[PDB]
Structure 1
Amino acid sequence: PLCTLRQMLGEARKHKYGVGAFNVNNMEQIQGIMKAVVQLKSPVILQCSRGALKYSDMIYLKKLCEAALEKHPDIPICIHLAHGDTLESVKMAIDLGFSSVMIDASHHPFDENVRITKEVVAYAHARGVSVEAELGTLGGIENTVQLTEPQDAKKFVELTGVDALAVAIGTSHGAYKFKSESDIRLAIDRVKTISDLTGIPLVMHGSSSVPKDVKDMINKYGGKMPDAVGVPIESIVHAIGEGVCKINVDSDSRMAMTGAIRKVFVEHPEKFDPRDYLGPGRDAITEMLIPKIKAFGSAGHAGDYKVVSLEEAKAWYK
């Protein structure tokens, strides 16, 4: 059933596992993601960006998530606004039925980040909805990136009461996160300190790994992504063990679908039925995701708890 981010990640903090949060834009993506979490009996977070909602005129995406919730009632499923920037985007998402939202005001100074985030927490928690916020900015270390200062994270959470905190540790969006695989620099040592000082679930953004087979397929069949590099899965597993409970992954699913289509285009150029290539694209998403979900550690946990509904969740904040 629909599940809050607070309960879902609370459970991952407790057992020291992490839950992948996968952005969705259409039917095949959601199916690719659900087949993997179902096969592994794992909880899941489906997140929707403003770009996704625009792409699907909103109602179509809302309906697709309904289908998922209905087809697999036994899977704790969190529907999350991936990256809202105002209170307005939050009311909109909550109206569509989401159980969680992210409010990102990290590019503002501390007190303004606190203020904007506090407004959202009041509105969301009044309806039982979870809130994720961010302190610090994304970008690679190798000047202007602002990594999370643990002592300030402690203060931020105390002042806002967010349910989860996105941390800045050297990751960034996209398929080109580091200049090479031989020199990957992350600031994961502080995760444990942030987790202990805040006492709450942490979130990592820009965390696709850019798996070898997915990249090789794209470049083998006419794609041009020779220098792609993502976050090593070992690093993510280390951060998970230190308190990271939610890992945002999008690029990996993007590449897996693109590589799959590119291969069908080359091996069978006479085929023109979209199911002929979107099918293998959906499945390549499932196959790429299975070893990832196991490493995150959420496999087997879908049946660990009884899902609290949004209505009952209101009591946590009163």
Structure 2
Amino acid sequence: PLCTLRQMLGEARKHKYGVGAFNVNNMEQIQGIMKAVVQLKSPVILQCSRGALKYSDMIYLKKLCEAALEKHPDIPICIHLDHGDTLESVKMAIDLGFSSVMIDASHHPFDENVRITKEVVAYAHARSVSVEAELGTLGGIENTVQLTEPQDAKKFVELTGVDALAVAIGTSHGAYKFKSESDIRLAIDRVKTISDLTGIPLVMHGSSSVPKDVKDMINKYGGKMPDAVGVPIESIVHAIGEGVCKINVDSDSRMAMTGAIRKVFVEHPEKFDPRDYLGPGRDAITEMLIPKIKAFGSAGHAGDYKVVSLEEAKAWYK
């Protein structure tokens, strides 16, 4: 059933497991994810950026999500707005029936962040909707990146009331996180500190692994993504043990789908039925996600708890 981020990650924290949070944009991507988490009876976060919502004209993604909720009433499923910039987009996602939002004001100074966030928290928590926010900014370390300062994090969380905090520890968006693979520099030491000080679920953004299998595959069949590196996966398992409950994953899927398509295009240039290549692309998503969910630790946990509806979530906030 439609779950809050609050409860879902509540349970993650408790059992020391992480829940992958997977960006979806069309029918085949949701189906690729759902396949993976149903098989392993895992809770799931399906997340849509404002761009996802624009691309699917909003209503299309809503209905596709309603389809995954109806198809699998056993799974806790949290529909999350990824990277809200404004109260405006937070509203739009709420009215679409999302059970969570993220307000990303990490780029304004601390007080403006806190300002902008309280505003969304006041709004969202009225309907039972969870709120992820972020302190610190994304980007590698190797410069204008602010890594989360744990003592500020504590205050930020007390000041704002958010259910989850996204941290900055040297991860960025996209397929090109680090220049070499020798020099992967993560600041995961502070994760345990941030988790302890705030007492809430933490979120890792830019968490794709850029797995070599898929990478070479793209380049092998016409693609041009040569020096692409991601975050190593034991780093993510380490951060999970230290308090990370939500693992944001988008690029890895993008690549899985694209690799399976280029492959059909090369091997069978005579085929033009989109089912012929989109189908293989769906299944590539599933295959790539299965080990990942297993490493995260969320597998088997789908039936642990009674999902609280948004109506009842309003009570947590009064």
Q: In the alignment, is the contact (CA less than 8 A) between 2:188 and 2:239 conserved in 1?
A: yes
Q: CA deviation at 1:234?
A: 0.5
Gaps of at least 5 residues in structure 1 are none
Q: How far apart in 2 are the matches of 1:260 and 1:216? A: 12
Q: CA deviation at 1:222?
A: 1.1
Residue equivalent to 2:279: 279
Q: How far apart in 1 are the matches of 2:226 and 2:288? A: 19
Q: CA deviation at 1:182?
A: 1.3
Gaps of at least 5 residues in structure 2 are none
Q: CA deviation at 1:106?
A: 0.7
Q: What secondary structure is seen at the aligned counterpart in 2 of 1:260?
A: helix
Q: How far apart in 2 are the matches of 1:201 and 1:221? A: 40
Q: How far apart in 2 are the matches of 1:173 and 1:111? A: 25
Identity of aligned residues (%): 99
Q: How far apart in 2 are the matches of 1:110 and 1:40? A: 40
Q: What secondary structure is seen at the aligned counterpart in 2 of 1:208?
A: coil
Per-residue CA deviation, residues 186-206 of structure 1 (Å, 9 max, x unaligned), is 110000000000000000000
Per-residue CA deviation, residues 162-208 of structure 1 (Å, 9 max, x unaligned), is 00000000000000100011110011000000000000000000000
Q: How far apart in 1 are the matches of 2:315 and 2:54? A: 33
Q: How far apart in 2 are the matches of 1:91 and 1:145? A: 29
Q: In the alignment, is the contact (CA less than 8 A) between 2:142 and 2:183 conserved in 1?
A: no
Q: CA deviation at 1:211?
A: 1.0
Per-residue CA deviation, residues 230-261 of structure 1 (Å, 9 max, x unaligned), is 00000000000000000110000000000000
TM-score, with structure 1 as normaliser: 0.99
Q: How far apart in 1 are the matches of 2:180 and 2:299? A: 31
Q: How far apart in 1 are the matches of 2:182 and 2:105? A: 33
Q: How far apart in 1 are the matches of 2:285 and 2:217? A: 13
Per-residue CA deviation, residues 105-140 of structure 1 (Å, 9 max, x unaligned), is 110111110011001111111111000000000000
Q: How far apart in 1 are the matches of 2:224 and 2:123? A: 45
Q: How far apart in 2 are the matches of 1:84 and 1:143? A: 24
Q: How far apart in 2 are the matches of 1:65 and 1:143? A: 39
Q: How far apart in 2 are the matches of 1:174 and 1:91? A: 27
Aligned residue pairs: how many?
A: 318
Q: CA deviation at 1:279?
A: 0.2
Matches within 5 A, 1:53-64: 53-64=53-64
Per-residue CA deviation, residues 54-103 of structure 1 (Å, 9 max, x unaligned), is 10111101110000000000000000011111111111111000000000
Q: How far apart in 2 are the matches of 1:316 and 1:59? A: 29
Q: CA deviation at 1:228?
A: 0.7
Q: How far apart in 2 are the matches of 1:35 and 1:182? A: 35
Q: CA deviation at 1:28?
A: 0.3
Q: How far apart in 1 are the matches of 2:83 and 2:144? A: 21
- Which segment drifts farther, 243-252 or 218-227? 218-227
Q: How far apart in 2 are the matches of 1:98 and 1:158? A: 24
After superposition, the Cα gap between the structure-2 partners of 1:143 and 1:225, relative to the gap in structure 1 and judged at 3 Å, is closer
TM-score, with structure 2 as normaliser: 0.99
Q: In the alignment, is the contact (CA less than 8 A) between 2:17 and 2:297 conserved in 1?
A: yes
Q: What secondary structure is seen at the aligned counterpart in 2 of 1:219?
A: helix
Q: What secondary structure is seen at the aligned counterpart in 1 of 2:252?
A: helix
Q: In the alignment, is the contact (CA less than 8 A) between 2:76 and 2:307 conserved in 1?
A: yes
RMSD of aligned Cα (Å): 0.6
Residue equivalent to 1:219: 219
Q: CA deviation at 1:12?
A: 0.1
Q: How far apart in 1 are the matches of 2:4 and 2:71? A: 19
Q: What secondary structure is seen at the aligned counterpart in 1 of 2:83?
A: strand
Residue equivalent to 1:137: 137
Q: CA deviation at 1:143?
A: 3.5
Q: How far apart in 2 are the matches of 1:302 and 1:85? A: 31
Q: CA deviation at 1:219?
A: 1.0
Q: What secondary structure is seen at the aligned counterpart in 1 of 2:264?
A: helix
Q: What secondary structure is seen at the aligned counterpart in 2 of 1:209?
A: coil
Q: CA deviation at 1:213?
A: 1.0
Q: What secondary structure is seen at the aligned counterpart in 2 of 1:83?
A: strand
Q: How far apart in 1 are the matches of 2:213 and 2:40? A: 21
